[PDB]
Amino acid sequence: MDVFMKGLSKAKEGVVAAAEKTKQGVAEAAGKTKEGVLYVGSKTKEGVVHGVATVAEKTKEQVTNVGGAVVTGVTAVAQKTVEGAGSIAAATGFVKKDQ
């Protein structure tokens, strides 16, 4: 008769903290190509390139000279998240009642 989710019922000096899916200082990288593609009876001929490509349907001579550098790729870097003092807190509570 008192059903309740993350609340606070007939109480005194109570705290509630609830952190869900809380990203704090994160480096999220997501390189995708299909995230929900749904084909029905469909004839598709896609294609993706991340870098250097030499594509064709018909050719006599294809030459590819990578004399330098081809750098690709998904990158996530979490460098110095906390330098010095200072905090990253989540879902924090207290009832400090010093006397």
Add this chain to the structure above:
Amino acid sequence: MDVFMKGLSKAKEGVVAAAEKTKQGVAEAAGKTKEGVLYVGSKTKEGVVHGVATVAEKTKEQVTNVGGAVVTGVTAVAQKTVEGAGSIAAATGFVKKDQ
């Protein structure tokens, strides 16, 4: 008879904190190509390029010279999120009742 979500019922000196999906100082990078594509009976011929491409349907000589650099890709960098003092707090509460 007192149904309640993240609130505060017949209480005294209570706190409630609720942080959901709270990004705080995050570096979110998302390089995608399809995020909900839905084909029905459709004939498609797409194509994507992230870099250098030499495409054709018919050719006699294709030459590609990458003498320098081809840098591609999704990048997320979380550099010094907290320098020095100072905080990143979420879902914080207290009932400090010092005496």
Add this chain to the structure above:
Amino acid sequence: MDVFMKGLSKAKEGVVAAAEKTKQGVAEAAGKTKEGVLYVGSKTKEGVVHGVATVAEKTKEQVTNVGGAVVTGVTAVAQKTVEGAGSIAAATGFVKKDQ
């Protein structure tokens, strides 16, 4: 008759902390190609390239000279998450009642 999820019932000087799926200073990298693809009766001819490619359907001579460097790939780096003092806390509570 008092059903309740992560709350605080008829109590005194109580704390509750609940951190779920809380990323704090993380380096998340995800390089994917299909994350939910669903084909039904569909004739597809896709293709992806992460680097250097020399593609064709018909050719007489294909030459690929990687004289430099082709660097690809998904990378996640968690560098110095905490330097010096300072904390990364989650789901923290207390009832400090010093006397």
Add this chain to the structure above:
Amino acid sequence: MDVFMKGLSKAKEGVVAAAEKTKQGVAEAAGKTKEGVLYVGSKTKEGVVHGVATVAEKTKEQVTNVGGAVVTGVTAVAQKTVEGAGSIAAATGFVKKDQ
């Protein structure tokens, strides 16, 4: 009659901490190609490349010269997570009642 999940019933000076799936300073790298692909009666001819490729359907001479370096692959690096003092705490509570 008092059913309750991770809460705090008719108690006094209690704490509750609950950290679930809490990534703190982690380096997560995930290079995948299919994560939920579902084909039904569909004739597919995909293909992926992470590096250097020399593809064809018909050719007389294919030559590939990797004179430099082809570096690919999924990489996750957890470098100095905690340098110096400072903590990475999760699911922390206390009832410090010093007297």
Add this chain to the structure above:
Amino acid sequence: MDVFMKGLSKAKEGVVAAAEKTKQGVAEAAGKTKEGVLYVGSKTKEGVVHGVATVAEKTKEQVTNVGGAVVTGVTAVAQKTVEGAGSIAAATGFVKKDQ
């Protein structure tokens, strides 16, 4: 009549800590090709390459010269997780009642 999961019933000066699947300073690398693929009556001809490839359906001479280096592979490195003092704690509680 008092059924309850990881909470705190009619108690005094109690703590509860519960850390589940809590990654703290971990380097997780996962290079996969299929993670849930489900084919039904579907004729597929996929193919993946992580490195250097010289593919064809018909050829007279294929030559591949790796004069340098082809480095591939999934890598996870957990370098100095804790340097100096400082802790990585999980599921921590106490009732310090010094007198």
